[PDB]
Amino acid sequence: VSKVLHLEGEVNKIKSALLSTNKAVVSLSNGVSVLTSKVLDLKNYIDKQLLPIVNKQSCSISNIETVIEFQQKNNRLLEITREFSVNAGVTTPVSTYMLTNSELLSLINDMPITNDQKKLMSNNVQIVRQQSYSIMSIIKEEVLAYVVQLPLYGVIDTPCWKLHTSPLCICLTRTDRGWYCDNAGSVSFFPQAETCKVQSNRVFCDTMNSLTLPSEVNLCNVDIFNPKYDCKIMTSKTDVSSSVITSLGAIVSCYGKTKCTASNKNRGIIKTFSNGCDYVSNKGVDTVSVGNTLYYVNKQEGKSLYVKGEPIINFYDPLVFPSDEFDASISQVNEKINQSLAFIRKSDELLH
Amino acid sequence: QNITEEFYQSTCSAVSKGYLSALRTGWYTSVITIELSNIKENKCNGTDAKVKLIKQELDKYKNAVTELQLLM
Amino acid sequence: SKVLHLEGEVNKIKSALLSTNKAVVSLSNGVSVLTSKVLDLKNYIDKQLLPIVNKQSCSISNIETVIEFQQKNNRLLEITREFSVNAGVTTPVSTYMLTNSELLSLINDMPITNDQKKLMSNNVQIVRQQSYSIMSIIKEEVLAYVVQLPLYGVIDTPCWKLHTSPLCICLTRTDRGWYCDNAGSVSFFPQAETCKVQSNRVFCDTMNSLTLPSEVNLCNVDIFNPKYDCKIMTSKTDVSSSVITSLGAIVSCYGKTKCTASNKNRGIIKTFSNGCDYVSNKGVDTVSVGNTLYYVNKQEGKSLYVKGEPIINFYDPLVFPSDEFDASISQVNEKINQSLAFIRKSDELLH
Amino acid sequence: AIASGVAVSKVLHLEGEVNKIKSALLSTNKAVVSLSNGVSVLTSKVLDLKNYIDKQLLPIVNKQSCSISNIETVIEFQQKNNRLLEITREFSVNAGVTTPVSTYMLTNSELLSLINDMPITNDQKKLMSNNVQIVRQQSYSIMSIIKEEVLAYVVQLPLYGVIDTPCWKLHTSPLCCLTRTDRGWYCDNAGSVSFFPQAETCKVQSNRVFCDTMNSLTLPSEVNLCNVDIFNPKYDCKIMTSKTDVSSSVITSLGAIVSCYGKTKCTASNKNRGIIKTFSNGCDYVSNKGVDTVSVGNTLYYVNKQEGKSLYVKGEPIINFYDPLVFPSDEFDASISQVNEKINQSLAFIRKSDELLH
Amino acid sequence: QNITEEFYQSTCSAVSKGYLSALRTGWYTSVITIELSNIKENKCNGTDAKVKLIKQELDKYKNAVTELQLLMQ
Amino acid sequence: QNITEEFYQSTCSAVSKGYLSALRTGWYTSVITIELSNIKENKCNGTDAKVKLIKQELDKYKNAVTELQLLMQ
Amino acid sequence: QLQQSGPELVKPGASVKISCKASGYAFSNSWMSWVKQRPGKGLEWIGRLFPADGDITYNGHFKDKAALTADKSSNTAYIQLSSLTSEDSAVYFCARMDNSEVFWGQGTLVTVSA
Amino acid sequence: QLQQSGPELVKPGASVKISCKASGYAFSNSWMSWVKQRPGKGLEWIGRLFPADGDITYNGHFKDKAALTADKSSNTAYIQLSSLTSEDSAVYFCARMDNSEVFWGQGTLVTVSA
Amino acid sequence: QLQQSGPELVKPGASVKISCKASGYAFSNSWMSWVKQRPGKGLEWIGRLFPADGDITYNGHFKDKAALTADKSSNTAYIQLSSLTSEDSAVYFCARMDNSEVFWGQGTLVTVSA
Amino acid sequence: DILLTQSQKFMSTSVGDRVSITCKASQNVRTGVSWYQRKPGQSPKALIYLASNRHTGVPDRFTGRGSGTDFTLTISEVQSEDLADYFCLQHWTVPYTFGGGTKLEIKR
Amino acid sequence: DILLTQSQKFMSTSVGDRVSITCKASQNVRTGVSWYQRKPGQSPKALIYLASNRHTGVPDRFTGRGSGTDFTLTISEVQSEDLADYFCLQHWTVPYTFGGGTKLEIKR
Amino acid sequence: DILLTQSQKFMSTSVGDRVSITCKASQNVRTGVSWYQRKPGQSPKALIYLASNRHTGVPDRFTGRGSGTDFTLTISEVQSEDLADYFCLQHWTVPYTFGGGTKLEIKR
Ligand SMILES: *[C@@H]1O[C@H](CO)[C@@H](O)[C@H](O)[C@H]1NC(C)=O
Ligand SMILES: *[C@@H]1O[C@H](CO)[C@@H](O)[C@H](O)[C@H]1NC(C)=O
Ligand SMILES: *[C@@H]1O[C@H](CO)[C@@H](O)[C@H](O)[C@H]1NC(C)=O
């Protein structure tokens, strides 16, 4: 109310307050102008340390899904390499990536052979594989060509028997053992012990390795000195003791001071033997002692055994960020900018 | 049960018959022509300038190819 | 006069400067918590990004040990496998335990003539089927095994395989096998397959052979030779037989056995009488003896294809549009320093 | 101006500066235009960076975290399941019957248990523990049942009748001019002599042989005396006939027999002493210690095996390398704390300038 | 050193003795029942919608199983 | 074309001659001494504390080594 | 060999099997077949079967009219011929088509029961 | 065969080995054993050894009293029996338990030196 | 065996091949060679070739003077000797160095055409 | 299926004559066919096995050839006893189709 | 170990008699045992090998059976010469345990 | 190449004499050499094959040894008929080098 003494003291008071209002911006604008440098430091940290980093692996770790998938999808060619690295062109028997199951079945049905044999070949699918062969012919970087070879058959369903010969009392012994096949006007004979394969009812042999005989040699089982056939003989006068194990029984040729004993594993000894040839069957007989040599006729059981494991589980963790209320807090600051305009515009009314 | 056997005291021999057979008299031959798949060579810069799975594994197949064709 | 005139606006700017500081309440607080906002993002790269990525950088780096253990060291990897199964004695020698060139050096190592050495370089595949490898010392850094190769005595003596057939009483031969010219004798091989198979060459053992005089070539004319006991199997009862060779066929047809030669494109060429006879494989492919059909020429099949197609890798790189964003930062960086023009010109008023 | 009663000569002193601070307070709010706008769009700038971690980083990494985690099954599936992985492969090729038994289908120790399982004597069991490699060449494995969770197969092992009866391999040679026909393995037996006509049913070891019994011949013990008498009245044996010609030589494992005859030139030699001798018409024996090479006609024989050399395939180990992650946070956050200081020392003038209400 | 040999000028033969032997007269059989371990199938979206290492490798074992069981009758 | 054959009606035999041969009369033996390469054990902390490809694969080689050396006496 | 039964009468509302027995021959491992004949139409294939394994085929134009069975113990085939008419009245033949046996049955004179 | 030595006197403060020699027999590749007997207690197993390889076993209740050695050259076993008393005074038997040799020694009459 | 041609005259401005034919011998699978001789200098190796495969070697000091060819059909070798002087006038020998054939030619008396 | 077409139904020759008979097919069947005879009120009989093989008990004047889709059945030196009906049969893959059937006659 | 229990220590029969003797075990040992004789001041002798085999030089009236944990030793037609002490022995896995030992007598 | 050095060019002995001749080499060549004769105006002849083997038709008084880089050619009981020129030849790897050549004489 004292126009000179009043009306300017508070004006002096707001003078430095307005100077502090411009000393405000020193506190205000500097810390945010260097905060601009702070986010550029974070802009510089994603510049070289994040984005050049991750994409290098994105082609580097993508190489193994070529590498495993080179060995995943192309697996059938990968096995067939390594046998001809070792088996050297001739491979036996034919494997199952060399020739899988279905193209066996088609190539059986391809050939100009009767259904009477074709159904039999489909039956013994495993044995014919042991008589099949393959030879590498042409092998290049995009070319892989090899000759598949399969056998063909002449006769079907002629009967057979394996011999087991034993010395008979002077005291002689036999000569002839092997397989026997009914043939056209003839008896096929196989001198070698294992040209023929093993199956419960069937055998499969070669023809370039066989002997041919007349059917009168079935009468060699009665007479020795047959005028019908020179039944082959192995001479002796000095005795020799022998026993021959068959697949379904046993023959003994015990003699003299040799002690011979048939036995059972649950009934003990069933019997002993005299001087001379005798036959026993495998159902009650399992072990036979000849001299000090114990023989077995029935095969020996063992036990079972287990190698055990348990499955495994994959684990990771996903990714996450709590953005929304954070961005709503940004929206809270976004509110503060525009309601500051109410402080701006109302205070800026005073020009008029 | 149809397979059996017998014995001959006249000769001290044996016969295990009941079988039936077939014998090989020829051959049947054919040709198989399997091909392969492969990849291209990527143009990128990776992490290490040493790991060459695209090359040092792929030529190892081609190291086998030069071996086997010299077995003729 | 105008006392209430120069005071009312002074009252008006009083709250305007008061609201100016009340604007700083709106100004300073939202940026002060924006400092907390970037620290949340500083806290999110603190634990959820930088500890994450580098764990795989040693974890996924382990497989480029694992595949590269099996990539570069592949030659030792196969040779582990056979002695796991072939058990010390390996036959025939593979091509990772002996990679081709160290055959060629070890051929040229041995004190044998060039006359044999060039022949061994020729049949590179057959000699591999007669070679052997035996494991001797196998440790964690030691892998020592014995490579074994055959040596040869004679070169280029002629040969022939026999095929006997019963001739008419009606007897039968015995002896079959291979025949080698020898110094003062004839080598003979009783066993069917001690000798290996090649179109012009055979390669057999010597501890498994028989020795014969050269007069046994005259067994093909005379049977009861005073020069040599040409071997025989007795018979009076007849037996019908046919023997397939590699390059023809022999028949011993007789009696009521029906025997027929044929061709797959010309049908039947002929039939046969009672007695031995020879046919060649060029016109003849099938021969029926009794009910047994034989084949002489091998049977063709077809071709078959297993087909695939190549595969392609794909990814996407990384990217960011930084520059105009940083220019927009530079736009704000302009705003800080031109604010100084609002600062300093307003701050002239002290003097 | 001049304003009477309202500080007459002082209106340029009083209200002139009031006009000067009027635009200064106006420019103060015009500074807020410079102030508030650049930070309000800086809010948009961090949201751009919030939008860049939104889709381009955070959904990226976890896709590989499933995708790379597949090969830590696939490499691992071929790692600890390895024993089943080999035994798939042989029955793909050996077709049911596998010989000899490998060492993943029977990993050593379960031979040692199954040796000790069987009701056979310790006298053989210790011998089977000795020759562990040969019995493996006589064992067999046959696939019985094979399914997705089932893998069952028959392991088969031989059993033995006799132990420790002596043996010898023969080497017969033509003698003047006749030759023999009788050669094979020989075994002492109960009242009998076992004979093996086939050349290789028996396995090879320095002191031991192991043969089959269903493939043998039985002989009386008087056939040891075919070696002195040819035409034994007790029991003579078989020979092949020739008249007065063949030259021959037979290589043994530990020596050599010659049957040099007629005009055939025969020569024993040494690789360091040269020729030791030559031969006459008739049978003769040489030992392998001084003799290594023998020429018969033009056929050079070897008795001692031939040495070669050693050869090396060499490599060197490899080293892994990477780099860790890092950030210099603390003084960066202290600079943030320096700005955090600036927010709170802003309050110094704030309360002081706003004191002026009272 | 205990293995030796001799010679017979009477027949031009030889004997390499010093050995001792054993002969096969039977069989001992047994049963082995090894099992396996495996994995589960993960339920998450990866990078590529083509790479099926969980499936296209695992069935390749099952492609072998159907093969070998068709070698028995 | 130089390989041919003939026939003998006198004995019902055959001769397929035209060949030329060689026979084994010795051995040539030598020694191969291949070595291997390997790695070191890294010192890092990875993602999972279970996956041991550095160890559980490398010992599997050494599991083979103890097997094979027990096939010798 | 073989043996085949006698005549037959078909009927609207009937299905019937016919007996053909292997007369003393190795039987269990070889095919069988059937073929019908009508004059003015000639021979007409029917089908083929294998015994003791049960491989059964069909002429698809004929497949629904009939079904194939057999005895492996007494070696006797059967074919259940459903309700047909006089246009299918024919003589029917049990026949094997082996290289070992090209044999033919005794025929089966079939008309309609009327 | 075998041969075993004569009597023995044990002593508090003594350990002694006993000789058993293979009397003309293929020796290097077969076991040996030992068993003691006391009347009123019967037979009592001791142990078993293999020569020229050195497989040594023990009865664990007896294991600390004695140690097993052998000669493979002169084919002679030894067993160092430490300081015992009259309750262990017994007759001791060198014995092989082969299918080829079930043999037994001559016994070893052992009491205390007194 | 072998047979070699007669004398020769070299010439400044000439190259000429010489004929050596395999006289009745298994030829296609064995080496050949050549050696020259000058008195006061002695024997001097030239080279070696294999027929029907074409393995050709050279003495590198001599390699540019000559070239090696052969006939595998009429079994005849050839060597194109280029324009030389009297210091290379010598007698030249077709020679095989086999264990089966150590043979030598008839010589080739060569001087300069003058 | 695969259709079979014969040339005609009847014949006319003299006795002792050689007659060539061919039926054809639509597709190559790899020699898997056979030929037959047929007599009125009597069972048929198989003649040419795998298009090549004369079966047992069949006279030697009976010949046949062919490999592709066309197959020749050539009969030589006919008699009064051989006047039967004759036909083919597809024998390679099911279904099995017949030939047209051909009755043999002379002088008409 | 595995314990062995015999039935008794003594016997009483007539001469020429058949005597069945059994000792038992705690666990199945897969036929790996043997039986013996013993004479006073004399060495023992092995009789039944692998619980099955009569050894060489041993008279034929001596029998034995058993497979499980229980094993029968059956002697037939005794005489005055066979009056010995008799016992068993575990023979399968170490340690080796004896039977109880049995002296054979008559008429008491 | 590999150089070969002989001891001298001429000899002087009596008849019926034993003469030891050695040429040496620079490096071990694993027994792959041979020795020869030579007569004036006449073809040479190979004598010692693979440094060990006397060839066919060559008299028995002609011996040779050596294994390393040094190889002895020892001739025994000379005659007037054997007075030829004599030399060696490298025979293992190309190029092939000769010995120095040695003419044999007596009494001078
Ligand atoms: C490797 O990365 C650098 C980074 O700029 C680039 O220049 C170079 O072309 C890259 N190399 C390859 C082979 O991609
Ligand atoms: C693949 O990712 C998309 C992204 O949202 C999601 O919707 C979909 O379910 C995912 N698929 C699978 C199989 O997880
Ligand atoms: C695993 O990571 C933690 C994180 O701090 C560290 O303390 C520890 O040493 C790490 N372990 C290994 C084996 O590196």
Side-chain angles (χ1 to χ4, degrees), chain D residues 66-67 117 144 155 157 159-161 164-166 170 173 207-209 211-213 228 254 283 285, chain E residues 5 10-12 14 16 19-30 32 36 44 47 68 72:
Chain D
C66 290
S67 292
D117 194 8
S144 297
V155 186
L157 279 81
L159 295 181
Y160 289 89
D164 295 337
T165 61
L170 297 183
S173 185
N207 301 116
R208 302 288 294 167
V209 293
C211 315
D212 284 334
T213 52
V228 177
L254 66 157
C283 183
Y285 182 70
Chain E
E5 57 179 355
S10 175
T11 58
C12 190
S16 297
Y19 294 98
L20 71 168
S21 178
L23 299 176
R24 181 187 65 84
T25 58
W27 292 104
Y28 183 78
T29 69
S30 180
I32 294 199
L36 56 89
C44 59
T47 301
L68 296 174
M72 296 182 291

Coordinates of all heavy atoms in Angstrom, one line a residue, chain D residues 66-67 117 144 155 157 159-161 164-166 170 173 207-209 211-213 228 254 283 285, chain E residues 5 10-12 14 16 19-30 32 36 44 47 68 72:
Chain D
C66 N 13.6 -74.4 -28.3 CA 13.0 -75.7 -28.7 C 13.8 -76.3 -29.8 O 14.0 -77.5 -29.8 CB 11.5 -75.5 -29.0 SG 10.4 -75.1 -27.7
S67 N 14.3 -75.5 -30.8 CA 14.8 -76.0 -32.0 C 16.2 -76.6 -31.8 O 16.6 -77.6 -32.3 CB 14.8 -75.0 -33.1 OG 13.5 -74.7 -33.5
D117 N 28.1 -119.5 -15.0 CA 26.7 -120.1 -14.8 C 26.6 -121.5 -15.1 O 25.9 -122.3 -14.4 CB 25.8 -119.3 -15.8 CG 24.3 -119.6 -15.4 OD1 24.0 -120.1 -14.4 OD2 23.4 -119.2 -16.2
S144 N 15.7 -113.9 -31.8 CA 14.5 -114.6 -31.5 C 13.2 -113.8 -31.6 O 12.3 -114.1 -32.3 CB 14.6 -115.3 -30.2 OG 15.6 -116.2 -30.2
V155 N 21.8 -116.5 -27.4 CA 23.2 -116.6 -27.3 C 23.6 -118.1 -27.2 O 23.0 -118.8 -26.4 CB 23.8 -115.8 -26.1 CG1 25.3 -115.8 -26.2 CG2 23.3 -114.4 -26.2
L157 N 26.7 -121.1 -27.0 CA 28.1 -121.4 -26.7 C 28.4 -122.8 -26.8 O 27.6 -123.7 -26.5 CB 28.4 -120.9 -25.3 CG 28.7 -119.4 -25.0 CD1 27.4 -118.6 -24.9 CD2 29.5 -119.3 -23.8
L159 N 30.1 -126.6 -25.9 CA 30.5 -127.4 -24.8 C 31.5 -128.5 -25.3 O 31.4 -128.9 -26.4 CB 29.3 -128.0 -24.1 CG 28.3 -127.1 -23.4 CD1 27.3 -128.0 -22.8 CD2 29.0 -126.3 -22.4
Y160 N 32.4 -128.9 -24.4 CA 33.6 -129.6 -24.7 C 33.6 -131.0 -24.0 O 33.2 -131.1 -22.8 CB 34.8 -128.8 -24.4 CG 35.0 -127.7 -25.3 CD1 34.4 -126.5 -25.0 CD2 35.7 -127.9 -26.5 CE1 34.6 -125.4 -25.9 CE2 35.8 -126.8 -27.4 CZ 35.3 -125.6 -27.1 OH 35.4 -124.5 -28.0
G161 N 34.0 -132.0 -24.7 CA 34.1 -133.3 -24.2 C 35.5 -133.7 -23.6 O 35.6 -134.1 -22.4
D164 N 43.1 -131.7 -23.2 CA 44.5 -132.0 -23.2 C 44.9 -133.3 -23.7 O 45.5 -134.1 -23.0 CB 45.0 -131.7 -21.7 CG 44.9 -130.3 -21.3 OD1 44.8 -129.4 -22.2 OD2 44.9 -130.0 -20.1
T165 N 44.6 -133.6 -24.9 CA 45.1 -134.7 -25.6 C 46.0 -134.3 -26.7 O 45.6 -133.3 -27.5 CB 44.0 -135.6 -26.1 OG1 43.2 -134.9 -27.0 CG2 43.1 -136.1 -25.0
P166 N 47.2 -134.8 -26.9 CA 48.2 -134.2 -27.8 C 47.8 -134.3 -29.3 O 47.0 -135.1 -29.7 CB 49.4 -135.0 -27.5 CG 49.0 -136.3 -27.0 CD 47.7 -136.0 -26.2
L170 N 50.1 -133.2 -40.1 CA 51.1 -133.9 -41.0 C 51.5 -133.0 -42.2 O 50.8 -132.1 -42.6 CB 50.5 -135.2 -41.5 CG 50.1 -136.3 -40.6 CD1 49.7 -137.4 -41.4 CD2 51.3 -136.6 -39.8
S173 N 55.0 -136.1 -48.4 CA 55.7 -135.7 -49.5 C 56.1 -137.0 -50.3 O 56.2 -138.1 -49.7 CB 57.0 -135.0 -49.1 OG 57.7 -134.5 -50.2
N207 N 49.4 -123.5 -29.0 CA 49.5 -124.7 -28.2 C 48.2 -125.5 -28.2 O 48.2 -126.7 -27.8 CB 49.9 -124.4 -26.8 CG 51.2 -123.6 -26.7 OD1 51.2 -122.5 -26.3 ND2 52.3 -124.3 -27.1
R208 N 47.1 -124.9 -28.7 CA 45.8 -125.5 -28.5 C 45.1 -125.5 -29.9 O 45.3 -124.6 -30.7 CB 45.0 -124.6 -27.5 CG 45.6 -124.5 -26.1 CD 45.5 -125.8 -25.4 NE 44.1 -126.2 -25.1 CZ 43.7 -127.4 -24.6 NH1 44.6 -128.3 -24.4 NH2 42.4 -127.6 -24.4
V209 N 44.3 -126.5 -30.1 CA 43.4 -126.6 -31.2 C 42.0 -127.1 -30.7 O 41.9 -127.6 -29.6 CB 43.9 -127.6 -32.3 CG1 45.1 -127.1 -33.0 CG2 44.1 -129.0 -31.7
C211 N 38.2 -128.5 -32.3 CA 37.7 -129.0 -33.5 C 36.3 -129.6 -33.2 O 35.8 -129.6 -32.0 CB 38.6 -130.1 -34.0 SG 40.3 -129.7 -34.0
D212 N 35.6 -130.0 -34.2 CA 34.3 -130.6 -34.1 C 34.4 -132.2 -34.0 O 35.3 -132.8 -34.4 CB 33.3 -130.3 -35.2 CG 32.8 -128.9 -35.1 OD1 32.7 -128.4 -34.0 OD2 32.4 -128.3 -36.2
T213 N 33.3 -132.8 -33.4 CA 33.3 -134.2 -33.3 C 32.4 -134.9 -34.3 O 32.5 -136.1 -34.5 CB 32.8 -134.6 -31.9 OG1 31.6 -133.9 -31.6 CG2 33.9 -134.2 -30.9
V228 N 56.9 -146.2 -40.1 CA 58.1 -147.0 -40.2 C 57.9 -147.9 -41.4 O 58.6 -147.9 -42.4 CB 58.4 -147.7 -38.9 CG1 59.6 -148.6 -39.2 CG2 58.6 -146.7 -37.8
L254 N 57.0 -124.8 -39.4 CA 58.2 -124.7 -38.6 C 59.4 -125.4 -39.4 O 60.3 -126.0 -38.8 CB 58.1 -125.2 -37.2 CG 57.7 -126.6 -36.9 CD1 58.2 -127.0 -35.4 CD2 56.3 -127.0 -37.0
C283 N 64.3 -137.4 -50.8 CA 63.6 -136.7 -49.8 C 64.7 -136.2 -48.8 O 65.7 -136.8 -48.5 CB 62.6 -137.6 -49.1 SG 61.6 -136.8 -47.8
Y285 N 65.1 -133.0 -45.3 CA 64.4 -132.1 -44.4 C 65.4 -130.9 -44.0 O 66.6 -131.1 -43.9 CB 63.9 -132.7 -43.1 CG 63.2 -131.8 -42.3 CD1 61.9 -131.3 -42.7 CD2 63.7 -131.3 -41.1 CE1 61.3 -130.4 -41.9 CE2 63.0 -130.4 -40.3 CZ 61.8 -129.9 -40.7 OH 61.1 -129.0 -40.0
Chain E
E5 N 59.3 -130.9 -33.3 CA 58.9 -131.7 -34.4 C 59.9 -132.9 -34.6 O 60.9 -133.0 -33.9 CB 58.7 -130.9 -35.7 CG 60.0 -130.2 -36.0 CD 59.8 -129.4 -37.3 OE1 58.8 -129.5 -37.9 OE2 60.8 -128.7 -37.6
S10 N 61.7 -142.9 -43.4 CA 61.1 -144.2 -43.8 C 59.9 -144.0 -44.8 O 59.7 -144.8 -45.7 CB 60.6 -145.0 -42.6 OG 59.9 -146.1 -43.0
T11 N 59.2 -142.9 -44.6 CA 58.0 -142.6 -45.4 C 58.0 -141.2 -46.1 O 57.1 -140.9 -46.8 CB 56.7 -142.8 -44.7 OG1 56.7 -141.9 -43.5 CG2 56.5 -144.2 -44.2
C12 N 59.0 -140.4 -45.8 CA 59.1 -139.0 -46.2 C 57.9 -138.2 -45.8 O 57.1 -137.7 -46.6 CB 59.3 -138.9 -47.7 SG 59.7 -137.2 -48.3
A14 N 56.2 -136.2 -41.8 CA 56.7 -135.4 -40.7 C 55.6 -135.4 -39.6 O 54.5 -135.8 -39.9 CB 56.9 -133.9 -41.1
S16 N 54.6 -132.8 -36.3 CA 54.9 -131.5 -35.5 C 54.1 -131.6 -34.2 O 53.0 -131.1 -34.1 CB 54.5 -130.3 -36.3 OG 55.3 -130.2 -37.5
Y19 N 51.6 -130.5 -28.8 CA 50.3 -129.9 -28.6 C 49.5 -130.7 -27.6 O 49.9 -131.6 -27.0 CB 49.5 -129.8 -29.9 CG 50.2 -128.9 -30.9 CD1 51.0 -129.4 -31.9 CD2 50.0 -127.5 -30.8 CE1 51.6 -128.5 -32.8 CE2 50.6 -126.6 -31.7 CZ 51.4 -127.2 -32.7 OH 52.0 -126.3 -33.6
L20 N 48.2 -130.2 -27.4 CA 47.3 -130.7 -26.4 C 46.0 -129.9 -26.7 O 46.0 -128.8 -27.0 CB 47.7 -130.4 -25.0 CG 47.9 -129.1 -24.3 CD1 48.1 -129.3 -22.8 CD2 49.0 -128.2 -24.8
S21 N 44.8 -130.6 -26.6 CA 43.7 -130.2 -27.3 C 42.4 -130.3 -26.5 O 42.4 -130.8 -25.4 CB 43.5 -131.0 -28.6 OG 42.4 -130.6 -29.3
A22 N 41.3 -129.8 -27.1 CA 39.9 -130.0 -26.6 C 39.0 -130.0 -27.8 O 39.3 -129.4 -28.9 CB 39.5 -128.9 -25.6
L23 N 37.8 -130.7 -27.7 CA 37.0 -130.9 -28.8 C 35.5 -130.6 -28.4 O 35.1 -130.9 -27.3 CB 37.1 -132.4 -29.2 CG 38.4 -132.8 -29.7 CD1 38.5 -134.3 -30.1 CD2 38.9 -132.0 -30.9
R24 N 34.7 -130.0 -29.3 CA 33.4 -129.6 -29.0 C 32.4 -130.8 -29.0 O 32.3 -131.5 -30.0 CB 32.9 -128.6 -30.0 CG 31.5 -128.1 -29.6 CD 31.0 -127.2 -30.7 NE 30.8 -127.9 -32.0 CZ 29.7 -128.6 -32.3 NH1 28.7 -128.7 -31.4 NH2 29.7 -129.2 -33.4
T25 N 31.7 -131.0 -27.9 CA 30.7 -132.0 -27.8 C 29.3 -131.6 -27.4 O 28.5 -132.5 -27.1 CB 31.1 -133.2 -26.9 OG1 31.3 -132.7 -25.6 CG2 32.4 -133.9 -27.4
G26 N 29.0 -130.3 -27.3 CA 27.7 -129.9 -26.9 C 27.4 -128.4 -27.1 O 28.2 -127.8 -27.8
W27 N 26.4 -127.9 -26.5 CA 26.0 -126.5 -26.6 C 25.5 -126.0 -25.3 O 24.8 -126.7 -24.5 CB 25.0 -126.3 -27.7 CG 25.5 -126.5 -29.1 CD1 25.2 -127.6 -29.8 CD2 26.4 -125.7 -29.8 NE1 25.9 -127.5 -31.0 CE2 26.6 -126.3 -31.0 CE3 27.0 -124.5 -29.5 CZ2 27.4 -125.7 -32.0 CZ3 27.8 -123.9 -30.5 CH2 28.0 -124.6 -31.7
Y28 N 25.7 -124.7 -25.1 CA 25.1 -124.0 -23.9 C 24.4 -122.7 -24.4 O 25.1 -121.8 -25.0 CB 26.1 -123.7 -22.9 CG 25.6 -123.0 -21.6 CD1 24.9 -123.7 -20.6 CD2 25.7 -121.6 -21.4 CE1 24.4 -123.1 -19.5 CE2 25.2 -121.0 -20.3 CZ 24.6 -121.8 -19.3 OH 24.1 -121.2 -18.2
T29 N 23.1 -122.6 -24.2 CA 22.3 -121.6 -24.8 C 21.8 -120.7 -23.7 O 21.8 -121.1 -22.5 CB 21.1 -122.1 -25.6 OG1 20.2 -122.7 -24.7 CG2 21.6 -123.1 -26.6
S30 N 21.4 -119.5 -24.0 CA 20.8 -118.5 -23.1 C 19.9 -117.5 -23.8 O 19.8 -117.5 -25.0 CB 21.8 -117.9 -22.2 OG 21.2 -117.0 -21.3
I32 N 19.0 -113.2 -23.8 CA 19.3 -111.8 -23.4 C 18.1 -110.9 -23.7 O 17.6 -111.0 -24.8 CB 20.6 -111.3 -24.1 CG1 21.8 -112.1 -23.6 CG2 20.8 -109.8 -23.9 CD1 23.2 -111.5 -23.9
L36 N 15.3 -100.5 -24.1 CA 15.8 -99.2 -24.5 C 15.2 -98.1 -23.7 O 14.2 -98.3 -22.9 CB 15.5 -99.0 -26.0 CG 14.1 -99.1 -26.6 CD1 13.3 -97.8 -26.6 CD2 14.2 -99.6 -28.0
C44 N 5.9 -77.3 -28.4 CA 6.2 -75.9 -28.5 C 6.6 -75.6 -30.0 O 7.0 -76.5 -30.8 CB 7.4 -75.5 -27.6 SG 8.9 -76.5 -27.9
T47 N 11.7 -72.7 -34.6 CA 12.1 -71.8 -35.7 C 11.5 -72.2 -37.0 O 10.6 -71.5 -37.6 CB 13.6 -71.6 -35.8 OG1 14.1 -71.2 -34.5 CG2 14.0 -70.6 -36.8
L68 N 12.9 -106.0 -39.7 CA 13.6 -107.1 -39.1 C 12.6 -108.2 -38.7 O 12.8 -109.4 -38.8 CB 14.5 -106.7 -38.0 CG 15.6 -105.9 -38.5 CD1 16.5 -105.4 -37.3 CD2 16.5 -106.6 -39.4
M72 N 11.2 -113.3 -40.0 CA 10.9 -114.5 -39.1 C 9.6 -115.1 -39.6 O 8.6 -114.4 -39.8 CB 10.7 -114.0 -37.7 CG 12.0 -113.5 -37.0 SD 11.7 -113.1 -35.3 CE 10.7 -111.7 -35.5

